[PDB]
Amino acid sequence: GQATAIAHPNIAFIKYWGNRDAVLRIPENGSISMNLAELTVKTTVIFEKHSREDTLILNGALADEPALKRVSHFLDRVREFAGISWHAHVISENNFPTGAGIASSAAAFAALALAATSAIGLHLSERDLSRLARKGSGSACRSIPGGFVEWIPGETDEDSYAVSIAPPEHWALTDCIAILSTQHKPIGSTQGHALASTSPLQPARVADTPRRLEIVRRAILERDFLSLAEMIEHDSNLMHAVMMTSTPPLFYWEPVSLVIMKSVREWRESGLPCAYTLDAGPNVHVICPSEYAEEVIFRLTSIPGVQTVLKASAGDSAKLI
Template sequence: MSVHAATAVACPNIAFIKYWGNRDHPTRLPENGSISMNLSELTTRTRVTFDPSLPNDIFDLNGIRQTTASLQRVTSHLNLIRGLRGVSTRAHVHSENNFPAGAGIASSASAFAALTLAAVNALGLEMSEKDLSRLARRGSGSACRSIPSGFVEWYRGISDIDSFAVSIAKPSHWDLVDCIAVVESGHKKTGSTEGHKLASTSPLQNARVQDTDRRLDRCRDAIIARDFETFAEIIEQDSNLMHAVMMTSRPALLYWEPATIEIIKAVQTWRKAGIPAAYTVDAGPNVHIISEAKSLDAIKHRLSSLPGVKEILIAHPGGPAKIV
């Protein structure tokens, strides 16, 4: 086999109805369905080069050679893809993020969406969006949502075959904006992969999962109708439910920092003052403040004055993973 290479770009996503807990960890089959929005200005760019001269896989992330768990995770995913093509050729993976990784901005989602698409393309495999989503899910559950475009729903499914993500609305459907308050840009102590394994130890997880269909329906309907009031109510409730599960797991997971709570309180105050905004927090301390674009300037102005906010990132609804 000669050298074959491809480069892909993918956006991370912010989950409105969140994925937390697997019913099968190796295949990352989720306990519940989820809904998210791709984040256009934030990207992972990954080049995969399959080279017969390489004795082992090589993984460079943001210019730093990886030698531990992250390399093993990439190799495991590449092994799945190599198996589909019937080859064993090792690869050199170059990946660059333009946003903080490991701090609750879904870096693994864009990472494995881009890795999947680039590797599949480099090996000449033909795959539908559905199958790309299924394959990306094997690397990182939320990565399946970064394959399609815009507003995306990940079906829980019954098995590996029907657990994948689809676009429910184009990026242009609703002019939402995600104003991300970065309070910590370092890697979290407990990653999402380990956190998912702890979800079942919380006495609240079953109740959260059983109520998911109601939240999915309300969120989906609110997005289609562009009903921000209903949307805000349901995404905040869903975020709180997930973190309640985290906090009551054994051992407990507390991702929030003091600034996280201050920002949440501020968003509630702003809304009472007539500024439509809603918060949601993934597995990390950073707060995603979702609003319609017309409210962005007011939110940025207020957010910049809050102590503990180190950086503000802005993202709009983003497109699908793509080859570049």
């Protein structure tokens, strides 16, 4: 069997950080995100019988074994669930700008989930692809559905999955991603999550998440941008508060990250609707009603230290091609 599927990365408005079950990637808290249309992972899966072990190609090159044992531990699940014991060649490509440091894990395991199961013949519901993608990478659950997506955290493998709050066309929001020239090579998120429990502030952050989710959920449905803007900045600061207070601390911010966060908040307070959020890295995502993207991109491009500004709009669900 053979299939090919594409998925978008997503930007979390309410952050996933910390695991209730690290293996199954059942999160301590729920999260909400928007798919990013202009960036894509395309992955083809080819099951061939009696090939010894699994094979992984990434952007044309033989993936490193860390990458391969991730995908083949993943494909083990697609086997345990299909009965079928075939190994497979995985070929994946993405169009992510060169060294901008943009996280691919979500888009990649969303695509891997859709192509692998379709290639091995199955026909999973959207809810079930997301339960599957989740086990490859937490935030991958959220790239399976489209548009604005909520991840229902749950306490079991069956209860933890994501669903579309709203389709992409429901709210014309843009993400202007400030890529920082100077960029470091940060601790990967899987370790970061594990260290969240060393933070004295993680329990309080986690317990407060339903308050934050309800405000953002309502804001997306009602298209209430100022409520969205203040909450995503607060949620992003809460996650980084936890990161910065872990042992050892995780300081993903670069000095220019600080400049951008302060500038975005000043821009919004003086009239330009905009808001910042950061993942486990120094790039700064600026969310704005798309009618303001030009202005936001202009102001971001003038900030010393900003290498370039990517422009992404609300993207759709993972799809077979």
